[PDB]
Amino acid sequence: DPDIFNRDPRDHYDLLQRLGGGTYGEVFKARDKVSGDLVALKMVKMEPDDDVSTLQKEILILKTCRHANIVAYHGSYLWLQKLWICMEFCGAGSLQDIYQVTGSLSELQISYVCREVLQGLAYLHSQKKIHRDIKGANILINDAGEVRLADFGISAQIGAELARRLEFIGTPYWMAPEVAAVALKGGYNELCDIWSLGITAIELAELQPPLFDVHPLRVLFLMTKSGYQPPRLKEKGKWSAAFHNFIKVTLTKSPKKRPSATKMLSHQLVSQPGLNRGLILDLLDKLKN
Amino acid sequence: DPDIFNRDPRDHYDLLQRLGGGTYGEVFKARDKVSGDLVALKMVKMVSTLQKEILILKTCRHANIVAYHGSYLWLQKLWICMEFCGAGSLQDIYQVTGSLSELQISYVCREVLQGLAYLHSQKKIHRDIKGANILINDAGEVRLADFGISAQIGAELARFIGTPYWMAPEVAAVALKGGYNELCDIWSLGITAIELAELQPPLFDVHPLRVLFLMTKSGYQPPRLKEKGKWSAAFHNFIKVTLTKSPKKRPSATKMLSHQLVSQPGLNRGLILDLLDKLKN
Numbered sequence: 001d002p003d004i005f006n007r008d009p010r011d012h013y014d015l016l017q018r019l020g021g022g023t024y025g026e027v028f029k030a031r032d033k034v035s036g037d038l039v040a041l042k043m044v045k046m047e048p049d050d051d052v053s054t055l056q057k058e059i060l061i062l063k064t065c066r067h068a069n070i071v072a073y074h075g076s077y078l079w080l081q082k083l084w085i086c087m088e089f090c091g092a093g094s095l096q097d098i099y100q101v102t103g104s105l106s107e108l109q110i111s112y113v114c115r116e117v118l119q120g121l122a123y124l125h126s127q128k129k130i131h132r133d134i135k136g137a138n139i140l141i142n143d144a145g146e147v148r149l150a151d152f153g154i155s156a157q158i159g160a161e162l163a164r165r166l167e168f169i170g171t172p173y174w175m176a177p178e179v180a181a182v183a184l185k186g187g188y189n190e191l192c193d194i195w196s197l198g199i200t201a202i203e204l205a206e207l208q209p210p211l212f213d214v215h216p217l218r219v220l221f222l223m224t225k226s227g228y229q230p231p232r233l234k235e236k237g238k239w240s241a242a243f244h245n246f247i248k249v250t251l252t253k254s255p256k257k258r259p260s261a262t263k264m265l266s267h268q269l270v271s272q273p274g275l276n277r278g279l280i281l282d283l284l285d286k287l288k289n
Numbered sequence: 290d291p292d293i294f295n296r297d298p299r300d301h302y303d304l305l306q307r308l309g310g311g312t313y314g315e316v317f318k319a320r321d322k323v324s325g326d327l328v329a330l331k332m333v334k335m336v337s338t339l340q341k342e343i344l345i346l347k348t349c350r351h352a353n354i355v356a357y358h359g360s361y362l363w364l365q366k367l368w369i370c371m372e373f374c375g376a377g378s379l380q381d382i383y384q385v386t387g388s389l390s391e392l393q394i395s396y397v398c399r400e401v402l403q404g405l406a407y408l409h410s411q412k413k414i415h416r417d418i419k420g421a422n423i424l425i426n427d428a429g430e431v432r433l434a435d436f437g438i439s440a441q442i443g444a445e446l447a448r449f450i451g452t453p454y455w456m457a458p459e460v461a462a463v464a465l466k467g468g469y470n471e472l473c474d475i476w477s478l479g480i481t482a483i484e485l486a487e488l489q490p491p492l493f494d495v496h497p498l499r500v501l502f503l504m505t506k507s508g509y510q511p512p513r514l515k516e517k518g519k520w521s522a523a524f525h526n527f528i529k530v531t532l533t534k535s536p537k538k539r540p541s542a543t544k545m546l547s548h549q550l551v552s553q554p555g556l557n558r559g560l561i562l563d564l565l566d567k568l569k570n
């Protein structure tokens with residue numbers, strides 16, 4: 001990055017506590033020594049012979065995002081083989097941290113979250129970005145009940161490995177169209193995000209994604225099989241017809257048939273009136289007591 | 290390599306002339322000091338890529354795949370000893386000779402398909418079929434060479450990254466199965482047949498990054514032969530079937546060996562010897 005600070009951020013902030021890990025490195029809650037403003041500081045070990053391409057891609061994605069539903073980016077610091085990414089602190093943490101105390105979210109709470117996640121996804125996809133890691137752990141809630149997408153770690157690793165491999169591609173004139181597709185897009189597109197959101201809606205309703213108790217390799221294997229059935233909500237009478245259909249269209253097995261984020265935004269579940277932050281303020285009141 | 294010779298090959302061979310580059314490294318013509326026998330020596334400066342390459346070559350025992358004689362390692366230089374092909378690549382040839390005849394193309398395609406049927410039966414993929422990688426020996430025989438891309442894919446594959454529970458099925462598909470299979474070689478053979486007929490692959494005058502973008506863009510149309518009247522209905526059909534856009538519908542190498550173009554009588558090395566006589570004058 002060109003605007004990186006060649007100094008230790010602990011000269012400007014005090015590390016209050018560790019917030020978690022993530023795809024790579026760790027996140028600390030930090031306080032600005034002068035202003036008293038809270039920030040999230042993500043620290044990663046940046047060795048002298050390391051590639052650099054992944055961290056460069058991650059800060060590029062964050063730096064070029066200017067949307068309410070994507071975590072704000074403040075700046076980056078490089079010091080003594082440690083890279084620090086300064087981002088917006090989200091007071092209630094992740095939806096996963098929340099539902100683990102609170103229990104399953106209500107349909108209206110899931111609906112506001114889905115609409116906020118879809119707004120962030122429509123923004124990302126419009127500027128040729130893919131999150132690729134949509135899940136409860138990556139959806140953050142600030143004190144105002146606002147929703148922000150975080151952890152572009154998986155996205156950065158893929159973007160870096162795709163650029164790296166595009167150098168060793170060679171001439172394409174003899175390449176089959178499917179070979180061209182894995183070289184340029186990895187063999188899939190941004191609609192993988194729409195499916196992840198559908199799994200996230202179930203995760204929020206049932207406290208775990210479908211097949212959580214099945215071997216990670218076996219779940220991948222079952223998806224590769226013919227006659228693979230997309231997951232569904234367990235408790236049939238707990239949820240409205242709009243919620244069941246939202247799950248049905250987001251979890252369309254074929255990406256050619258799966259709706260885009262913009263189309264999804266006009267779905268009855270996320271288009272309904274009365275979806276606002278107040279629904280999430282009620283969730284946070286339950287977190288506090 | 291477990292069978293590598295830990296000495297300089299220039300103890301046994303005299304380096305005669307550089308034949309070319311290729312995916313990686315350089316290829317030299319070499320002559321055995323005592324027997325006078327000719328070999329091709331592929332020299333690579335210095336790990337899993339080269340291991341996967343020696344293994345692909347060592348485990349091939351088929352007439353239409355360049356014969357492997359062994360490997361040498363001395364002072365950070367790895368040397369791969371293979372069959373020397375006196376007439377060079379089909380690209381070296383057609384650049385002097387001009388377009389191949391339909392019968393010459395048909396024989397070349399049958400030979401390449403025989404080599405591809407063998408590779409696919411061993412679960413190997415060439416992934417770099419083109420005129421420059423199709424070699425011709427002095428007898429007019431056809432051999433597939435440069436397993437550099439295949440080795441680089443193999444090594445890259447050897448080293449999924451997300452969390453499977455939120456992963457879309459097409460994402461899981463590209464991780465377990467590949468984003469493509471061995472039928473990509475069948476398409477590459479269709480392009481090579483056009484290249485042998487026209488002296489260049491389709492869209493050769495278009496920027497490579499642009500070419501990649503037209504291909505991924507749905508509604509991309511498979512290429513065809515430019516001079517419709519010069520070629521037979523069987524040759525036009527062979528181009529149509531090898532260049533099927535859908536990997537599920539594209540015929541296999543053994544299926545293509547029953548196609549009228551490559552099944553016809555009178556397909557022999559003599560057709561290529563007629564071509565080499567044209568090169569000689």
Ligand SMILES: CNCc1cc(OC)cc2c1CN(c1cccc(-c3nncn3[C@@H](C)CC(F)(F)F)n1)C2=O
Pocket residue numbers: 019020021022023027040042071087088089090091092093094097137138140150151152
């Ligand atoms: C386990 N609870 C997390 C937690 C609990 C909490 O409680 C008050 C507050 C926060 C977090 C995280 N966070 C934050 C803020 C900005 C970016 C990122 C980020 N950028 N890259 C990966 N991350 C996160 C998702 C990784 C990881 F592992 F921390 F979640 N995180 C908060 O402001």
Ligand SMILES: CNCc1cc(OC)cc2c1CN(c1cccc(-c3nncn3[C@@H](C)CC(F)(F)F)n1)C2=O
Pocket residue numbers: 308309310311312316329331355371372373374375376377378381421422424434435436
């Ligand atoms: C440009 N003319 C080449 C040329 C001209 C020639 O004239 C009499 C003879 C030969 C060659 C090549 N060759 C050979 C033989 C075995 C393997 C390999 C090989 N193994 N890995 C990549 N290759 C080749 C395809 C790469 C490259 F760049 F050399 F073509 N090559 C010959 O016997």
